[PDB]
Amino acid sequence: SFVILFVTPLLLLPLVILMPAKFVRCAYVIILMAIYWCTEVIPLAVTSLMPVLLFPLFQILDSRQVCVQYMKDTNMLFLGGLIVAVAVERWNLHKRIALRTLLWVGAKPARLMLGFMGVTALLSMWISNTATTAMMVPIVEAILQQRKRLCKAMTLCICYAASIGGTATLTGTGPNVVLLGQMNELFPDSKDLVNFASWFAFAFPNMLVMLLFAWLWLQFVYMRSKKNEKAALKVLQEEYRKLGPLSFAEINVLICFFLLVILWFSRDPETKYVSDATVAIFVATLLFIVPSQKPKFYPPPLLDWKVTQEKVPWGIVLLLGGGFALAKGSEASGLSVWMGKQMEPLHAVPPAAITLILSLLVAVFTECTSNVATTTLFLPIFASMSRSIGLNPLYIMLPCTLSASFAFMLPVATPPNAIVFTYGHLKVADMVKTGVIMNIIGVFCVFLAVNTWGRAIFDLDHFPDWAN
Amino acid sequence: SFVILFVTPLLLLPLVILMPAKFVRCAYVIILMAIYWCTEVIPLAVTSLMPVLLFPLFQILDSRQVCVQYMKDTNMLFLGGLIVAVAVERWNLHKRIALRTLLWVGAKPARLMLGFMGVTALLSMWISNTATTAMMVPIVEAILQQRKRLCKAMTLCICYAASIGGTATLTGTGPNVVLLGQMNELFPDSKDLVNFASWFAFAFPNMLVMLLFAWLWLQFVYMRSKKNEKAALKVLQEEYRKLGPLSFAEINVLICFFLLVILWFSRDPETKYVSDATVAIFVATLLFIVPSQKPKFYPPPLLDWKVTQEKVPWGIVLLLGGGFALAKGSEASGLSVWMGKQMEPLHAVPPAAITLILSLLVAVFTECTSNVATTTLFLPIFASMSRSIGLNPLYIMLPCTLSASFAFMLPVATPPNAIVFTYGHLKVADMVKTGVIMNIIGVFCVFLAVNTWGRAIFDLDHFPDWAN
Ligand SMILES: *[C@@H]1O[C@H](CO)[C@@H](O)[C@H](O)[C@H]1NC(C)=O
Numbered sequence: 001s002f003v004i005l006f007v008t009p010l011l012l013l014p015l016v017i018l019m020p021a022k023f024v025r026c027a028y029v030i031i032l033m034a035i036y037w038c039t040e041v042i043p044l045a046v047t048s049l050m051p052v053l054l055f056p057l058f059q060i061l062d063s064r065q066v067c068v069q070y071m072k073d074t075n076m077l078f079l080g081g082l083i084v085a086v087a088v089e090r091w092n093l094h095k096r097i098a099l100r101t102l103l104w105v106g107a108k109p110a111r112l113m114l115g116f117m118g119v120t121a122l123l124s125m126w127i128s129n130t131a132t133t134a135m136m137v138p139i140v141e142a143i144l145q146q147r148k149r150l151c152k153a154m155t156l157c158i159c160y161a162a163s164i165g166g167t168a169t170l171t172g173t174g175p176n177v178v179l180l181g182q183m184n185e186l187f188p189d190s191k192d193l194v195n196f197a198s199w200f201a202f203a204f205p206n207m208l209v210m211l212l213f214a215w216l217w218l219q220f221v222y223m224r225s226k227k228n229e230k231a232a233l234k235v236l237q238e239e240y241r242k243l244g245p246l247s248f249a250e251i252n253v254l255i256c257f258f259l260l261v262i263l264w265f266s267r268d269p270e271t272k273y274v275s276d277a278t279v280a281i282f283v284a285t286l287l288f289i290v291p292s293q294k295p296k297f298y299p300p301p302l303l304d305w306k307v308t309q310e311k312v313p314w315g316i317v318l319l320l321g322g323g324f325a326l327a328k329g330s331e332a333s334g335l336s337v338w339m340g341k342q343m344e345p346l347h348a349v350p351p352a353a354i355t356l357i358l359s360l361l362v363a364v365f366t367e368c369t370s371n372v373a374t375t376t377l378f379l380p381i382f383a384s385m386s387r388s389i390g391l392n393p394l395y396i397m398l399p400c401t402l403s404a405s406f407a408f409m410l411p412v413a414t415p416p417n418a419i420v421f422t423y424g425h426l427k428v429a430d431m432v433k434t435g436v437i438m439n440i441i442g443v444f445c446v447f448l449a450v451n452t453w454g455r456a457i458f459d460l461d462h463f464p465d466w467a468n
Numbered sequence: 469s470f471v472i473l474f475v476t477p478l479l480l481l482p483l484v485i486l487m488p489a490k491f492v493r494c495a496y497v498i499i500l501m502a503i504y505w506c507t508e509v510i511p512l513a514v515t516s517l518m519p520v521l522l523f524p525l526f527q528i529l530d531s532r533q534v535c536v537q538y539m540k541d542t543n544m545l546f547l548g549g550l551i552v553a554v555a556v557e558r559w560n561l562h563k564r565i566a567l568r569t570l571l572w573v574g575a576k577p578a579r580l581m582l583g584f585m586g587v588t589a590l591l592s593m594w595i596s597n598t599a600t601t602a603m604m605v606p607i608v609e610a611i612l613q614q615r616k617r618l619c620k621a622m623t624l625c626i627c628y629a630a631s632i633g634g635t636a637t638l639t640g641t642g643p644n645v646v647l648l649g650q651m652n653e654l655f656p657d658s659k660d661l662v663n664f665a666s667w668f669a670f671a672f673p674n675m676l677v678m679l680l681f682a683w684l685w686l687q688f689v690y691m692r693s694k695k696n697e698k699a700a701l702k703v704l705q706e707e708y709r710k711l712g713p714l715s716f717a718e719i720n721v722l723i724c725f726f727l728l729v730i731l732w733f734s735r736d737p738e739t740k741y742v743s744d745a746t747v748a749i750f751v752a753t754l755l756f757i758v759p760s761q762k763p764k765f766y767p768p769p770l771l772d773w774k775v776t777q778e779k780v781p782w783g784i785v786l787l788l789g790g791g792f793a794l795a796k797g798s799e800a801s802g803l804s805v806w807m808g809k810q811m812e813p814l815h816a817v818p819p820a821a822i823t824l825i826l827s828l829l830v831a832v833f834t835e836c837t838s839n840v841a842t843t844t845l846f847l848p849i850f851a852s853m854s855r856s857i858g859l860n861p862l863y864i865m866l867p868c869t870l871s872a873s874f875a876f877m878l879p880v881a882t883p884p885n886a887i888v889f890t891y892g893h894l895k896v897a898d899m900v901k902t903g904v905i906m907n908i909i910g911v912f913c914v915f916l917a918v919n920t921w922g923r924a925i926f927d928l929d930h931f932p933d934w935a936n
């Protein structure tokens with residue numbers, strides 16, 4: 001069974017060691033790492049460390065040129081975002097925001113589902129999508145204890161909303177960070193063309209329209225009620241009180257978060273040095289000295305180190321670094337130029353079809369693998385193709401990144417779906433039926449976004465000189 | 469009180485922003501980070517992230533040139549060592565080795581203390597010194613429940629032995645890794661002159677002699693017994709049984725550890741690419757597929773990801789990276805050349821005095837700060853001095869690294885001393901009296917090592933061209 005998945009490649013190492021052309025060796029590396037990505041027999045971060053273990057033997061890079069690539073500005077940006085998210089989770093803040101929103105919108109099962117989806121998307125924009133599901137699903141259970149075709153709807157709404165809302169912030173989730181990293185590496189002359197501001201402008205409207213379509217679809221398939229308008233409130237309120245009053249530390253973390261947002265947007269409404277990573281580190285550092293209590297001599301802070309050592313996806317960081325290393329090795333060996341020399345005859349094809357086909361393919365493929373793995377595997381190929389056919393790479397690379405998060409079925413695809421299914425009445429057939437359509441929805445919305453307004457944001461109708 | 473420690477430096481930022489010479493700005497950065505190092509009001513890894521937050525504003529480096537420096541071959545070497553250590557701790561192996569050794573040596577309070585110190589040093593060579601103390605101190609308590617001048621001796625023996633034994637492996641603890649990193653950065657033409665093999669050869673004899681002197685001293689100050697020969701055995705044996713038999717997974721992790729050691733030594737008893745980091749990653753990766761049980765289809769491994777996400781000092785990794793970034797900024801701005809131009813007139817001095825004085829100073833100073841912080845602050849200065857006075861840098865840099873771990877008092881200096889003091893009868897006066905002398909012992913032993921055999925290992929009698 002699962003033994004061949006790590007012993008069979010040993011057959012090829014003595015065959016590929018000689019192979020008097022390095023792009024073959026890099027290709028074998030990438031294929032092996034993909035096979036391990038899709039199969040979690042071995043973890044992900046572990047496989048992200050293969051490049052240092054393989055590029056040397058294949059005489060591609062040293063252990064220095066490759067290991068230097070495992071931490072760059074993107075990774076520390078993501079790390080700062082994660083730390084801020086940890087501060088938010090530490091104090092039951094996201095629960096307070098959630099309950100306030102739910103009580104404002106009202107308990108009307110239609111508007112109820114709308115509020116759940118909207119707040120889940122807004123929280124997922126910064127707050128580690130799985131965490132939001134963990135926070136919210138107990139609320140749904142508490143509601144429902146007070147139709148087997150209804151529980152499925154809201155339970156799926158949480159996960160779909162989270163996976164969608166994560167695509168509205170450049171931290172958000174892995175794939176967007178991967179896009180930023182590959183843009184920096186493959187296209188360094190594109191110094192700062194895809195930043196937090198521009199990408200947010202591109203993505204947030206797309207997120208909103210996808211969320212609208214999703215709410216409509218899930219209100220169709222499952223729901224084509226005075227107590228549940230009332231006895232749901234008596235649960236929301238009693239859960240609200242348990243948080244207690246406004247909890248002074250919550251205020252300070254909110255202020256720090258607002259400052260982060262303002263600094264990210266403001267710089268980009270000269271010999272620049274001050275990339276967004278500096279801002280993230282600014283606020284993350286600041287989150288260790290602030291008191292969390294009234295000084296009336298600051299014994300108490302609001303964030304210690306032990307929790308953030310416990311609660312941070314470092315494996316994700318190493319995963320990104322593996323992507324960086326793969327891109328560097330491909331650029332060095334000679335594989336990228338080779339692919340760009342094999343994808344020449346696509347010059348006759350309409351690019352819109354290319355974009356749509358590849359986005360659909362990625363949305364399908366991410367439903368078995370992880371999102372970030374899918375992205376970091378696919379993006380360099382599309383980049384080389386775009387360079388070859390006189391096309392702007394972003395045209396292809398943005399929709400792929402937005403699509404890699406479209407894991408709307410297969411609970412193994414993304415943890416949130418697993419968490420939702422763990423509570424029972426969400427038979428996988430329901431998930432597949434409701435997920436394929438939403439994959440299509442997301443693809444169409446993304447294509448609309450790229451061909452409508454992304455043009456002017458990124459100047460996609462012309463062939464930039466930063467893709468020679 | 470502790471408020472000025474992070475608000476007073478704000479006075480100087482608008483004063484130092486202009487400062488038409490960049491070495492002043494880098495110096496202010498280093499001073500501030502030192503002040504935060506010595507004062508744990510803010511954690512350590514957080515302060516290690518200041519360089520990305522400061523070098524840009526001071527127009528020294530971008531956010532890319534500096535953030536690229538936070539992960540290099542040294543850090544991943546240390547990470548692999550940490551992961552292997554985690555595998556060891558996972559299965560109660562180090563306890564099994566310990567009990568076997570203790571039962572072999574015997575329960576004779578003299579030889580008992582000797583066995584405790586020796587095994588603690590041997591385990592600390594790879595196994596995260598604090599962990600060994602946590603493992604062993606309960607054993608001492610169990611023994612002693614079955615002289616208030618005796619408990620102090622063994623209780624201090626654990627911590628001293630751990631802090632000494634950590635200086636015998638290039639993973640070991642932070643300072644040695646810092647030395648390797650600074651050698652790579654400041655002196656890159658010294659490609660691989662300080663590796664695991666050479667440094668181990670230099671250090672292990674020094675560790676042995678220091679441990680001998682320490683055992684002698686602690687047998688002097690406190691201890692200038694049939695039951696404790698007997699009723700200690702009835703505790704060791706009954707603790708041994710609780711581990712059960714040899715626990716098949718233990719065997720596999722031992723085999724992996726042996727393979728790691730053999731690969732580290734063997735390569736160094738051509739266009740090299742295969743540095744020790746590759747080996748560490750090799751074995752660390754291997755530690756995720758091995759079964760830990762009889763396959764009789766490998767449901768069970770021996771190391772999952774969640775534990776190593778929980779139990780790994782990542783803050784240490786970021787700390788090292790901060791050291792790397794500081795060194796890069798100093799080399800870029802113009803500060804290193806400036807220091808080398810101010811330390812010219814030391815050409816008239818005997819280098820032996822320089823080495824001894826600086827080693828003593830570092831051994832004193834590390835008893836309030838952390839070891840790794842002390843090292844990464846001090847080493848570039850000594851390097852610049854050595855370049856200036858026609859001297860081999862290693863002469864000065866090795867003893868400083870070995871000395872930074874000589875935290876033989878001030879429980880705040882190093883966690884092991886804190887753990888020992890947490891159990892009571894180790895009044896701080898005793899610790900100081902017994903610790904200053906051992907600082908002197910360590911300094912003398914290190915000086916003997918450098919001036920005796922380190923010469924031939926590193927060719928310290930000549931001025932290498934890799935220090936121009
Ligand atoms: C960059 O552009 C120039 C066109 O003048 C081209 O000759 C050169 O090969 C290109 N280099 C890369 C790395 O794309």
Ligand SMILES: *[C@@H]1O[C@H](CO)[C@@H](O)[C@H](O)[C@H]1NC(C)=O
Pocket residue numbers: 935936
């Ligand atoms: C390296 O050595 C040469 C001596 O030929 C010296 O001129 C040059 O300045 C040195 N460069 C550095 C960076 O030490």
Ligand code: NA
Pocket residue numbers: 366367368369370371404406407413414
């Ligand atoms: Na997925």
Ligand code: NA
Pocket residue numbers: 834835836837838839872874875881882
């Ligand atoms: Na210390």
